[PDB]
């Protein structure tokens, strides 16, 4: 099916294990970013918050890629 | 999403902000009676350097 | 297209609502082209302790 | 000669790893209402019907 | 190393101040350490 392959965001500043520890830490502790960056390790909490913002979660369920949606 | 719901949304939004303005006026009259109440915005500074 | 985009925007201002376009900020390329202001605002909110 | 036995400056030690709070002014952060719903919406009735 | 034994507060407009880094406001406010005219005023001396 049209599944969201979330672990393909492995851009060189991050890694697949880093994204996995990020997701498991946010599921462990809700939005306490100091504990989340502690669980991930080797990264500031601002990078964790930024990479959590920039995840393409719902873009594969919306209509367009970027004609137009119209009204 | 029709008209009769879009105006009932605006009535359940104006009545919120009227109570919010009542809170804003009461938190002004509290500090004008020399009682340190908090406002809609936070308390600005502390005793550190700025007043 | 200017007659439609300046009619719904003419309704948003007259209703009193504000904010970003909901269907623009819902995607992921918005937070990749605005990578500059988010690193400022995340540090500002985190350092003040509101995140 | 082993390091840390070399002569070093007599100075106040480093306060680099200290946590600071900030005095932000009154109108800097907006007023926030509408607590967001973290929980996912359930669609049991729609798929049941 | 000394542990933090006090509460430290800097104002919000001083958010840019970071150790081991020289901001642009420090250059435009104290320019004599960054115009290489006197050898006894280098940015290493300023950082020290």
């Amino acid at each position: 099916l049209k599944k969201v392959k979330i672990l393909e965001q492995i851009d060189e500043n991050w890694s697949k294990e880093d994204l996995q520890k990020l997701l498991k830490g946010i599921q462990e502790f809700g939005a306490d970013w100091y504990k989340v960056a502690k669980n991930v390790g080797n990264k500031s909490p601002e990078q964790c918050i930024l990479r959590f913002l920039q995840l393409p979660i719902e873009d594969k369920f919306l209509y367009g890629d970027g004609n137009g949606l119209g009204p | 999403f029709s008209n009769k719901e879009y105006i009932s949304r605006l009535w359940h939004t104006l009545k919120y902000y009227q109570d919010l303005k009542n809170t804003r006026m009461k938190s002004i009259t509290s500090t004008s009676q020399k009682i340190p109440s908090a406002s809609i915005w936070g308390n600005g500074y502390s005793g550190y350097g700025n007043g | 297209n200017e007659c439609i985009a300046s009619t719904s925007n003419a309704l948003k201002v007259l209703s009193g609502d504000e904010g970003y376009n909901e269907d623009m900020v819902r995607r992921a390329n918005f937070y990749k082209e605005n990578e500059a202001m988010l690193r400022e605002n995340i540090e500002v909110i985190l350092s003040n302790g509101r995140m | 000669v082993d390091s840390k036995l070399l002569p070093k400056n007599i100075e106040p030690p480093l306060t680099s790893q200290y946590s600071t709070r900030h005095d932000a002014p009154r109108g800097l952060f907006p007023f926030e209402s509408y607590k967001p719903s973290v929980q996912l919406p359930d669609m049991a009735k729609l798929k049941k019907m | 190393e000394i542990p933090q034994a006090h509460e430290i507060v800097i104002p919000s407009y001083s958010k840019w101040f970071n150790l081991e880094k020289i901001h642009s406001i420090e250059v435009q406010s104290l320019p004599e350490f960054f115009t290489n005219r006197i050898p006894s005023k280098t940015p290493e001396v300023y950082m020290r």
């Binding site: 809700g30 939005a31 | 936070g42 502390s46 005793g47 550190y48 | 003040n48 302790g49 509101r50 995140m51 | 709070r21 900030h22 005095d23 926030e32 209402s33 509408y34 607590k35 967001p36 973290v38 | 933090q4 034994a5 006090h6 509460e7 507060v9």
Partner: peptide, 22 residues
């Protein structure tokens, strides 16, 4: 009877404000 100053470890005046989702 001691009284802590605002420059005490843990006795700041800037209280931690919580986000709405928490």
């Amino acid at each position: 009877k001691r009284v802590p100053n605002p420059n005490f470890l843990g006795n700041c005046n800037i209280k931690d404000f919580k986000p709405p989702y928490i």
